[PDB]
């Protein structure tokens, strides 16, 4: 919530891989095998489809006038539901369950963008077509 920065990674090259004697190989989209879901991969390809930069929320901030304790919920999927019921630490021990409002300023957003990477022309096999894959980027 108080993250001023954005954390990102980058892999090692082949020159640092031959030195001291893999993790970063140029992978095709036909060379994905299914079982690489969760490994860091370096894919090479042309980009045909790109989208506009859009703000996607990460955490939804709700404010109340009755208690003052602003709550924050975390979303993970593409969609979500509005938490109209109060889950604060003061409304649990109370008969009243007063209305909550949303804040578009205290909520943390991210510059989300989808892209379609395509398979390289000479890396595709004989007869096959260059199928695509989706890349979801965020931040800077």
């Amino acid at each position: 919530l108080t993250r001023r920065y954005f954390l990102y990674f980058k892999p090692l090259s082949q020159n640092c891989a031959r030195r001291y004697r893999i993790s970063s190989k140029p992978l095709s989209v036909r060379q994905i095998k299914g079982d690489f879901l969760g490994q860091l991969i370096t894919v090479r390809g042309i980009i045909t489809r790109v989208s506009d930069v859009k703000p996607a929320v990460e955490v939804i901030a709700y404010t109340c006038d009755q208690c003052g304790y602003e709550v924050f919920q975390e979303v993970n999927s593409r969609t979500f539901t509005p938490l109209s019921e109060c889950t604060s630490e003061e409304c649990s021990q109370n008969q009243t369950k007063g209305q909550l409002f949303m804040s578009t300023r205290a909520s943390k957003f991210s510059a989300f963008q989808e892209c379609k990477i395509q398979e390289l022309s000479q890396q595709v096999p004989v007869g096959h077509i260059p199928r695509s894959l989706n890349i979801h980027v965020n931040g800077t």
């Binding site: 893999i22 299914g34 079982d35 879901l37 969760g38 490994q39 975390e74 993970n76 007869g127 096959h128 077509i129 260059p130 199928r131």
Partner: protein, 566 residues
């Protein structure tokens, strides 16, 4: 009941070291690839060593694989742990060989022998999208920095049905703290759902095809594509589907009396004319057209070049003329007398054509495919009547599959190609309704010039009223056999491949250079026609089943050219 079966499989593996050295080779290949930094952990078991070694174990595998397959894979995992001595996953099995009565057609596959393993061959119609599934999900607690994990089971991970445990995905901790989804330490196993029906040559053609569904694991997801003949081996489980563990991608009987008859009819030089005249006695005339139809249904050679593209062996025939004759009556004869043939009307296909139909789904995986008509017949013949009514989409499709014999489909999920080495028989009608010699021979077809270049032989049948020739048609229609030419055509297709000689190269070079005359007088001659001028020769040379070609084959091809061009 588990210990006795695991010691019997250990004794069978100690007797036969062919699987032990194979799994040691699997492990040393994995170690060499790990040292450089994979194979999908399965060993095919020859069933012929299981019948003579143990009869009861063989019978138990054939009647109860749910109680016989997991102790054998437990023995295989124990052998993989005992054969390896380095530090630090399951292992599966596979079978092959003859099955007897268990090997059957899917149309004859009924409610009997459920639990028993079924070997069934056929043609695949659809191959769904590859979908990953969760069998284990991990999570992290940031309040203390711990890691938690949960496992998932279903009715497709074991042969026996386990007690159903509907494990809810953890959106909360047991203490009540927040948590996140550790994407990456949780394994993913992909599955596929393919459909397979019976082959059109072995099935009693006239009926409906019956298809079945195969659920596929991670290992064998890259070896399936539509349009190929396949043989699957699985278990007919009914929660009705088959749990396919072994896939192998891959007709009149001949006696010794019929081979004497076709060897006796191989050296007489009057065989071709009477064999061309004996195919349809209900149709008067048109001898050279059925001579080309005889050369058409027997085939070519299908030459595959070294390190390059393949060469077309198939021939294509287009037939035009007035609609009074038997062009629509010849398709029924060529459909009922060939080895395998598919006939379509040319207009009325529910998909986008006779290839790459509609794609939609309503089940769990929201992707499904469909097979067309040209992707089913891979070596036979297809017949399209009313060629002028066929739209441009199928015309673009047959422009591409004519001399390349491959079809490429760029869908949202499917980006593969498949073989279409078939021969087309097109029958068309003019747009004016009638045609005579005094009209020009180019605008009467009302087809583009590229389609005239795609089709090899264009046969024009005239029907102007003439009192001399029209006197005997009434008494002829008012007035060698069928099971012999089928055996003749398939024995020529399977045994003899003809090669070229110097006696038949020069005469076809002379004929091609003499016609390249027709360009100034009546018809365009292309480079593709060079190829079609020797295909037919080879044809005639294999009609006589000689090991090489002759000069008379090029002469009868030039005679067929003079009849179909002038």
């Amino acid at each position: 009941v588990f210990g006795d079966r695991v010691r019997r499989f250990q004794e069978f593996l100690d007797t036969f070291t062919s699987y032990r050295d194979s799994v040691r080779s699997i492990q040393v290949y994995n170690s060499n690839n790990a040292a450089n930094y994979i194979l999908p952990h399965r060993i095919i078991i020859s069933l012929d060593d299981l019948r003579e070694f143990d009869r009861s174990f063989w019978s138990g595998i054939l009647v109860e694989p749910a109680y016989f397959i997991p102790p054998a894979e437990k023995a295989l995992t124990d052998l993989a742990d005992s054969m390896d001595d380095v530090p630090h996953h399951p292992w599966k099995l596979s079978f092959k060989g003859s099955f007897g009565a268990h090997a059957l057609s899917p149309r004859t596959l009924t409610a009997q022998h459920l639990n028993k393993l079924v070997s069934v061959e056929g043609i695949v119609t659809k191959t769904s999208l590859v979908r990953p599934k969760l069998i284990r999900s991990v999570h992290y607690a940031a309040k203390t920095g711990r890691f938690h994990y949960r496992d998932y089971t279903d009715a497709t991970t074991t042969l026996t049905t386990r007690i159903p445990t509907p494990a809810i995905y953890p959106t909360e901790d047991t203490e009540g703290n927040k948590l996140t989804t550790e994407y990456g330490y949780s394994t993913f196993i992909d599955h596929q759902r393919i459909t397979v029906q019976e082959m059109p040559e072995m099935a009693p053609a006239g009926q409906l095809p019956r298809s079945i569904d195969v659920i596929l694991d991670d290992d064998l997801v890259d070896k399936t594509k539509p349009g190929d003949r396949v043989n699957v081996v699985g278990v007919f489980k009914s929660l009705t589907l088959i749990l396919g563990n072994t896939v192998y991608p891959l007709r009149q009987m001949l006696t010794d009396f019929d081979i004497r008859n076709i060897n006796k009819l191989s050296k007489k030089k009057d065989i071709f004319d009477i064999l061309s005249q004996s195919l349809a006695p209900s149709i008067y005339g048109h001898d050279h057209i059925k001579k080309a139809i005889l050369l058409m249904l027997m085939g070519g050679v299908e030459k595959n070049l070294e390190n390059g593209s393949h060469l077309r062996g198939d021939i294509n025939i287009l037939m035009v003329g007035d609609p009074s004759t038997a062009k629509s009556q010849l398709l029924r004869f060529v459909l009922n007398t060939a080895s395998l043939a598919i006939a379509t009307t040319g207009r009325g296909s529910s998909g986008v054509g006779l290839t790459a139909a509609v794609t939609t789904d309503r089940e769990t995986g929201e992707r499904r495919l469909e097979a067309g008509a040209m992707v089913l017949a891979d070596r036979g013949v297809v017949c399209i009547d009313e060629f002028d009514k066929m739209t441009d989409v199928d015309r673009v499709a047959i422009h591409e599959v004519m001399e390349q014999q491959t079809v490429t489909i760029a869908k949202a999920g499917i980006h593969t190609t498949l073989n279409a080495r078939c021969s087309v028989i097109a029958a068309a009608n003019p747009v004016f309704g009638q045609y005579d010699v005094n009209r020009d021979p180019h605008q009467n077809i009302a087809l583009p010039d590229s389609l005239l270049s795609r089709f090899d032989l264009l046969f024009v049948v005239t029907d102007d009223i003439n009192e001399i020739r029209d006197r005997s048609i009434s008494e002829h229609v008012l007035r060698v056999t069928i099971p012999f030419l089928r055996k003749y055509v398939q024995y020529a297709k399977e045994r003899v491949i003809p090669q070229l000689t110097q006696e038949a190269i020069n005469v076809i070079v002379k004929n091609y250079t003499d016609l390249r005359d027709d360009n100034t007088k009546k018809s365009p001659i292309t480079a593709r026609t060079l190829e079609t001028l020797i295909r037919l020769a080879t044809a005639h040379a294999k009609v006589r089943l000689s090991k090489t070609v002759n000069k008379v084959d090029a002469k009868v091809a030039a005679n067929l050219l003079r009849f179909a061009l002038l």
